Amino acid sequence: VDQPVHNYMVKRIHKRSLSAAFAIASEALSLLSNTYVDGTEIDSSLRIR
Amino acid sequence: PAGIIPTGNVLSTIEVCAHRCIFDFFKQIRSDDNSLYSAQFDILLGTYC
16 A cells, blocks of 8 residues: 655756957047047047047 | 844953963954955745645
8 A cells, every 4th residue: 555755856056157248449448538638620520439 | 243233242351362262263353354244145946836
């Protein structure tokens, strides 16, 4: 004669990641780190670009 | 400490570094240390029946 069973299971997490790169040219940093020194006509076009 | 409210006021502030061969675990910090700020924990993500 049989008797009923109970089961207990435990599962755990597994850690992964996702990484993506993004480059900024040195002249872009120079154009965006002026801190209120430039502002002529030809510099604005390069800054907007 | 973990920022818990102290329960009892300790009297007789003496040099506890000399009586170091009591207690179980004695860590002495000069002014501050980066090992006081730790927040690792385990989490249970639900049980299913």
